[PDB]
């Protein structure tokens with residue numbers, strides 16, 4: 001019925017070049033079984049989209065990683081939104097959607113845009129820079145911790161903590177275990193900044209605590225919802241912006257089109273999110289014996305969704321290996337789909353738009369002038385270092 005495959009989607013050889021193995025996963029069938037970790041896998045757009053939009057059958061409360069929370073204890077207290085199902089997910093999701101609302105983006109857009117223009121001006125004075133550390137990392141670190149309301153001290157724990165959370169979604173390989181074996185300092189800092197006295201007024205974290213009045217969340221729920229923003233609102237955006245600059249460096253014809261019409265900046269970032277898919281994979285757990293694409297999946301089984309493979313499926317996308325800033329990206333699952341679709345997608349799109357807008361208006365060429373190093377993560381796909389030479393427009 002179901003083809004069995006020995007491909008390890010969490011090995012270094014897979015992270016280094018996943019596209020050939022992702023076609024093998026798609027072409028093998030709509031549902032595969034991965035003997036390496038005893039999990040079901042779906043790599044086509046159709047099945048990935050169906051699993052995401054059936055939260056009842058493919059639950060999230062038993063973990064969005066490999067580990068089954070009904071069988072093992074989670075390395076940290078479960079997230080009140082990511083690792084919950086309706087109706088327990090509904091009200092905490094509604095609060096976060098109002099904290100990161102369209103009305104919230106209006107209060108932060110000008111400061112986010114100004115900091116984006118100032119960063120590109122600073123990098124043009126240096127010429128040859130690292131598009132990861134000096135751009136993909138430096139810019140979100142310059143706007144997001146302030147928008148969260150975090151103090152200055154201890155911000156060096158934010159990125160290590162985020163990479164740990166995303167590595168912990170994977171199997172118990174060395175990547176996950178070495179991350180957990182280094183987690184105590186990063187866990188202590190993040191848990192402390194989630195408390196109301198440590199969140200500056202007006203920030204995202206303080207806004208969450210102010211939503212305990214309405215009966216949607218209780219005061220004891222607010223710290224964990226702040227923890228979700230510190231776990232998902234930084235490193236995701238870093239690799240998304242790093243992906244956008246990477247594509248603009250690998251597709252100069254698309255950079256020139258972006259320069260001619262900087263209003264394409266928002267879609268240029270969205271296409272980058274589809275092209276690279278910073279969030280490559282995560283899991284669901286069947287609550288019931290379900291038939292998916294002609295295959296019977298039993299109860300309590302982990303289902304691995306390949307978001308990046310779904311975003312490159314030729315059954316859904318015309319020329320999926322092509323970076324096209326004018327492509328109608330509507331329907332891609334880079335931000336997920338359904339009740340769990342990324343609640344911070346407006347913040348990420350704002351950061352990506354104003355950074356690509358600043359590059360469109362100020363930069364004439366982006367040329368790689370050094371060794372490209374890939375950052376390895378069980379869930380995240382991104383670059384460790386991207387040496388580029390920026391030519392002023």
Ligand code: HEM
Pocket residue numbers: 060064081082083093096100228229232233234236237239240241273277278279282333334335336337339340341342343344345347348
């Ligand atoms: C390029 C940037 C980003 C990408 C690619 C991304 C990707 C995703 C994806 C695919 C999901 C679905 C998870 C699932 O279905 O299990 C998700 C959920 C989530 N994201 Fe993002 N995200 C990004 C930025 C952000 C930002 C900026 C924030 C907060 C400021 C954030 C916070 C969250 C939260 C809290 C959830 C859980 C929502 C829920 O379970 O209902 N993410 N993200």
Ligand SMILES: O=C(O)c1ccc(C(=O)O)cc1
Pocket residue numbers: 079080081082083165166227228229231232236279
């Ligand atoms: O990057 C992600 O997919 C993600 C990680 C953590 C959380 C959370 O802490 O609720 C939500 C989303």
Ligand SMILES: [Cl-]
Pocket residue numbers: 076077187190191
């Ligand atoms: Cl924690």
